[PDB]
Ligand binder design. Sequence first.
Ligand code: HEC
Ligand code: HEC
Ligand code: HEC
Ligand code: HEC
Ligand code: HEC
Ligand code: HEC
Ligand code: HEC
Ligand code: HEC
Ligand code: HEC
Ligand code: HEC
Ligand code: HEC
Ligand SMILES: [Ca+2]
Ligand SMILES: [Fe+3]
Ligand SMILES: [Mg+2]
Ligand SMILES: [Mg+2]
Length: 800
Amino acid sequence: GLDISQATTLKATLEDVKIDNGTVSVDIVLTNANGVPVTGLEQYAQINAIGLGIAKLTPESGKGYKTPQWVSYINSVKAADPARSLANYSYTDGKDSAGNPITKEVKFTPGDAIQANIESSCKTTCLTVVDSGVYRYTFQTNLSTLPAIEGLDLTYDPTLIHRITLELQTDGSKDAKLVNSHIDFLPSDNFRVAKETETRTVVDLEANCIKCHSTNYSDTSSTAKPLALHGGRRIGIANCQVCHTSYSKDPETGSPLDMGAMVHAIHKGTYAMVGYSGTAYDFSGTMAKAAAESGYPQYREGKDVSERVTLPVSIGNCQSCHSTDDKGPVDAASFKHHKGLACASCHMSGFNPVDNSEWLTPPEGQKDRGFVGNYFHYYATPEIDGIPGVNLVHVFQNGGCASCHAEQGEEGSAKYHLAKANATKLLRTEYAYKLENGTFDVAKGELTFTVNWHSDVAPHQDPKVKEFWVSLTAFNGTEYTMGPRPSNGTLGRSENRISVNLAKVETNANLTAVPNGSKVTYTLTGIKAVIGTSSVPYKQIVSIGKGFMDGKLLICANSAELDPTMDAAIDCSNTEAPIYEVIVGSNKASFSADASNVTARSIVISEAKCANCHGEKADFSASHALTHAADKPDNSCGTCHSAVPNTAVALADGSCVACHNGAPAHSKKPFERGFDFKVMIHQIHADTRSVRRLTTDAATFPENPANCAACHDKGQLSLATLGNKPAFLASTGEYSPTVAACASCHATTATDSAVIGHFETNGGVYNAAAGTYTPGSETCATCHGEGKSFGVDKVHPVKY
Ligand code: HEC
Ligand code: HEC
Ligand code: HEC
Ligand code: HEC
Ligand code: HEC
Ligand code: HEC
Ligand code: HEC
Ligand code: HEC
Ligand code: HEC
Ligand code: HEC
Ligand code: HEC
Ligand SMILES: [Ca+2]
Ligand SMILES: [Fe+3]
Ligand SMILES: [Mg+2]
Ligand SMILES: [Mg+2]
């Protein structure tokens, strides 16, 4: 009491107990959710797995500090399956400068390989009940009778910190009756629990991975996507680390299984390897491309997986995964120290000591540092590096050793990796500004507003300010509407938006700036529109007379400034240094007839949640690269199309919805790739968008898209006023607001006419003629609003 077969939850800790003579054993305390010990395991006919592993944490040395690494005592040499040993291939991608197609090559090194593993085949056979719920595992594996493996030192050493892991699973259970636990200890100190500061953690699931990954292991829905590997049984980092060691490899490809090398390459979209049952897992998507383009008979659609990982931050954004704020692992700084496979996993993509065998020999009369060392020291170039434009050899020759080789508490290559992110923070603080409310004299066509700038050197006088965009958008109090595309006007070519570069006051005849210390008052004139049936520029700005103003300031920063006590900002016309751009947003101010506030548009998503995956203050100019991207936002087509820059900053306050709303202007897309913000964002992240503008690859969303709480906070989906918004008029017809929201996943076309009829029965319109919907007519909220009978929070797999 209580019997395993009536237990609904298991919790286990193998925190307990220890070994001698090479013979290892450990106690497993198996209990309830509440903590009633579960009895009868050792007899149980419904056990799926019981696995235990053990490993020592060996030290490493070289120039500077290098972190310790796990060695499993349990290992074996695996041979490659001949028919699943992947062949080399190539594929076309893009054109060179002459306009000729570029061919890329992907290369492998199939061959026998070491793999760390655990003890899985024993199960109950190794168990002796010792107490209520408390079992005892003695390893079949003895530390003394371990078969030698070439290159690997497997000798037992009680002075080194040690790990044992448990994976335990019953009744086919993906969560409730699944456990991974582990114990680290120091055998020599009578097997005492290791201090956090003694073992090796490096990354923590919650501090480092959860910002993007789902850990809803029990998720039953069709779109579940929890981070649980190997049939669903492996979920804890501490467990990964025993098998995914620096020496393990996939024999079919030569790919490393080292945890860092594997994790960097997966998220960079370069990793490929063959796993259980000969399934090829290609994280680049290029295998499927090659198969399509020239044949590749080892790729089997519907069994092998070849899809490009689409990471929502830069692979250079280390803080996404490695803590720098001292609230993660105590050994978090491990990422600052050189380690061949880690460094190579980004900078040496696609190279190997067989196809790049020259790099095994240093240049004449230089020291041999191994394959990776020699690349970093001698052979790397900007044209070939895994991060294009990077020059490692120049840092070797010119930047001093402490650039990569770090003593404990030094920065090492982190000085290069975090430099732009750090300077970005400082410059956003230093150039912070406030927009005051504007006074719009509509009959005069004149908007006056004041910027509270950081100093008495105004934006147009500061050569480190590349551009300083302020955009104003009409807002009628219900929802933004872009409207039809007008003919061009002096200030822009949109009915509802004007963007003006305040840094170019001296050459803009419509713009005046009057400084008063730090405060600069700007007067923009020529905002005039004849109101009738025709589309004309500023038509809504003029007829509504009010709305919002948003700032997007671009500061030029010096990419060669690495010392954080120096000034990062640099004169934009400087020619020595490569320059990168720092973005500084603002408050969202109002404009109106007397400069009083305009009530804020409702907030229906969480800024912080977008930032979990995209990082803080992500920029989306590059999302506007397809069409008229080089047109400036004060100039004709660029008013809407610009990427230089796109003039929105924040994600949750409706800045994007100023354009991405239910009334796209011209060359309209159909619903199934529609322009309206909720429709677009739902379709991208749920892979229901028929076509993405800039890539043929579907987003690889690391959460469950039906987990509404990935983006929405509790209380944001009441749906109470949603039916009062304007319908979304797509190319072919219009869709009422709640319909557009739900059908973006549920019905991107009229495939299932029961769903469509459900919409039409309850006040909804779906691909109807323009003007059919009357705001107010949808009655969706009564049943689907949060907390109702079929509430969006009850019916989807949410985790708030
Ligand atoms: C206003 C036009 C709407 C819209 C846009 C939706 N609903 Fe409903 N809905 C209700 C019930 C009882 C179900 C079935 C529940 C179940 O089988 O578990 C549904 C189903 C849906 C869906 C899912 C359709 C699909 O199979 O993909 C969608 C997208 C949807 N609804 C949207 C209940 C109600 C109501 C109770 C009287 C009301 C009113 C509405 N729904 C209104 C709307
Ligand atoms: C030892 C029992 C393992 C533990 C614990 C974990 N993994 Fe693993 N994994 C292991 C091996 C030997 C292999 C290669 C198999 C081969 O055929 O050569 C892998 C493979 C992966 C992969 C590649 C994709 C796949 O084959 O499914 C991934 C992404 C992976 N492993 C991840 C991973 C994670 C995150 C783990 C902790 C939750 C983890 N594995 C534990 C062996 C073992
Ligand atoms: C998740 C998508 C990551 C990003 C982005 C970066 N790193 Fe990483 N890194 C990650 C993991 C899961 C690990 C393995 C930890 C382990 O159990 O081995 C690492 C490891 C490294 C290491 C090696 C650390 C060590 O073995 O002690 C280094 C040197 C490293 N990472 C550097 C690094 C840099 C510079 C990054 C930004 C440019 C970066 N990593 C990103 C996960 C992820
Ligand atoms: C990054 C651009 C580096 C700079 C600058 C320097 N070194 Fe380096 N070195 C680097 C790597 C990635 C490696 C491989 C490490 C591995 O685990 O494979 C090496 C190797 C060495 C070694 C061997 C011992 C070791 O620390 O692993 C030595 C002794 C060494 N490098 C010396 C060295 C010196 C003297 C440098 C300044 C003139 C120097 N390195 C710069 C990366 C980089
Ligand atoms: C991807 C997760 C990486 C890992 C692993 C490593 N580095 Fe890296 N490196 C990466 C990026 C995205 C960049 C460019 C940074 C930028 O702001 O543009 C770099 C750059 C470097 C540099 C500077 C190169 C130059 O300025 O020309 C060095 C010296 C460097 N990287 C070294 C290095 C070492 C030694 C690593 C192992 C600890 C290592 N990198 C891992 C991305 C990634
Ligand atoms: C992780 C669970 C995410 C959450 C939370 C948010 N986004 Fe996302 N998004 C994610 C991925 C993996 C991708 C694909 C990235 C790629 O390179 O293709 C995206 C994509 C976007 C895009 C499109 C970018 C492009 O095609 O140019 C947009 C505009 C976007 N995401 C916006 C966005 C918003 C506003 C979110 C909060 C409501 C948000 N995302 C959350 C991963 C995740
Ligand atoms: C008008 C001034 C815009 C604002 C403000 C925002 N976007 Fe936009 N976007 C706009 C247009 C005219 C286009 C068409 C394509 C082009 O290159 O001009 C787009 C397109 C997008 C897309 C394309 C997605 C796809 O079809 O797969 C994305 C992902 C996108 N825009 C994102 C986006 C975000 C997140 C914005 C707020 C930061 C945003 N846009 C503002 C016009 C305008
Ligand atoms: C805002 C008032 C716009 C201005 C000014 C111009 N365009 Fe545009 N365009 C706009 C939208 C919202 C869209 C997407 C419609 C959708 O439903 O997704 C477009 C589309 C195009 C296209 C099609 C390619 C595409 O990215 O979808 C083209 C070729 C195009 N726009 C050209 C174009 C030109 C030449 C303009 C100046 C004469 C111009 N656009 C202005 C919105 C707006
Ligand atoms: C977004 C910025 C991420 C963070 C932070 C981390 N991961 Fe990730 N991971 C991300 C994406 C977009 C993908 C592809 C889509 C998907 O979820 O399948 C992944 C994938 C993985 C995998 C492979 C899963 C599989 O198919 O076998 C692994 C093993 C993985 N990610 C691990 C992982 C770890 C350990 C992280 C913290 C150190 C982590 N990721 C952070 C996006 C993001
Ligand atoms: C991030 C990738 C999202 C996930 C996951 C889900 N939604 Fe969403 N939603 C997203 C955005 C960018 C928007 C528009 C935001 C804005 O400022 O306009 C929306 C909007 C909605 C709406 C309209 C709500 C309203 O305006 O009153 C609804 C009804 C909605 N989303 C529903 C919803 C459901 C039920 C989800 C889980 C199945 C869900 N969303 C996921 C972004 C994201
Ligand atoms: C993508 C992010 C979605 C949004 C937006 C909406 N829904 Fe959804 N919904 C989505 C998925 C992938 C699923 C399947 C979940 C599962 O457990 O397999 C669902 C489920 C439902 C259901 C269940 C009943 C049914 O007949 O399917 C209902 C009733 C439902 N969803 C309603 C609904 C409404 C009203 C939405 C707009 C407010 C809506 N969903 C948005 C994915 C997404
Ligand atoms: Ca394999
Ligand atoms: Fe035309
Ligand atoms: Mg002027
Ligand atoms: Mg564009």
